[PDB]
Every structure is written in C-alpha cells, then in structure tokens.
Design a protein around this ligand. Sequence first.
Ligand SMILES: *SCC1=CC(C)(C)N(O)C1(C)C
Ligand SMILES: [Cl-]
Ligand SMILES: [Cl-]
Length: 162
Amino acid sequence: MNIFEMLRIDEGLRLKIYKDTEGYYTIGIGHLLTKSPSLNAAKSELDKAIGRNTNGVITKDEAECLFNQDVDAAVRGILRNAKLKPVYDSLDAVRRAALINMVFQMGETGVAGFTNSLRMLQQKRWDEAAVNLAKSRWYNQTPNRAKRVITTFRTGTWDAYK
Ligand SMILES: *SCC1=CC(C)(C)N(O)C1(C)C
Ligand SMILES: [Cl-]
Ligand SMILES: [Cl-]
C-alpha cells in the first residue's frame, strides 16, 4: 500500500465529468475542475488541463496523468507551507500519506486550518488527535473516508484500507 493506491481507493476513477460530494465538476481520480456551476466552464478547464478538445471524456492514461500531477502538487504544497511542513517532517511514512490524503481532498489552506489537530499530531498524541479531527465539517460530510484517514493517523498502519 502507498499514497497512490490509498487515494485511488478514496477517490475512485471516472472517465467522464461528474459532480463530487460537494456538487463540483470533477474528473478522473478526484481532479477538481471548477467550482462554477457551468458545465461549459468545466469542459473548458478540462480541455486546458489535457491539451485537446475532450468533449468531457478522457482516457485512463490521461486520468492517471492528472493524478500524478495532483499528488506531486499536494506533496510540494505541504513542503512549501509553514504550518504543514513541520508536521509532515515529524511524521512516519504511513502518517505522512494520511496528511497528503487530506491535502489532496480539501487543499493546503483547508488542512492548515486544523490548528489544534496539527499540534496534537506533532506531539504524537494519536488518540487525542483522532478525536479532534472528527469534530469537523470534513468528518460529518464524508464520514467513511474521514474514518479511514483518521484511523491511519491513530494507528500508523494501513489497516483501514485492507
Ligand atoms: S502527465 C504526463 C502525461 C501522460 C500522458 C497521458 C502520456 N500524456 O499525454 C502526458 C505526457 C501529458
Ligand atoms: Cl491542472
Ligand atoms: Cl465518505
């Protein structure tokens, strides 16, 4: 198990434009296209991201291309952020993947707002962090995915994904 397989489980794979849990236009492996309600705006972003006239449908290779770019962007967003980098540096390899997962889903600014959870993770207070992480809109809106990520933070194992 690794971060690519983990996010592939959490995000799924769809080759046609769809709406995510929030109603935003998305494609591939959780690649957010736009938060605008216009399908034409989403098709325009898609063509721009892929470099061709797609008409809303991409191939599996194109979906994995965006996926690689998005995982790379998430990791580099963590390392550039003054609040996230110290937490990431303090974590073991499995818990680092859990932090990448969160950044992938809600963005670098959103995760950096979990000020109290991040401090508990840095102090390695795993049970207390898990309780604090669940007191969030994130947990209430996507509870099954949040539980898997929180369990990864709590245990340091991949057991939630087996
Ligand atoms: S993101 C790299 C990528 C993969 C593939 C689908 C082969 N592509 O057209 C590019 C080179 C963009
Ligand atoms: Cl992009
Ligand atoms: Cl869920």
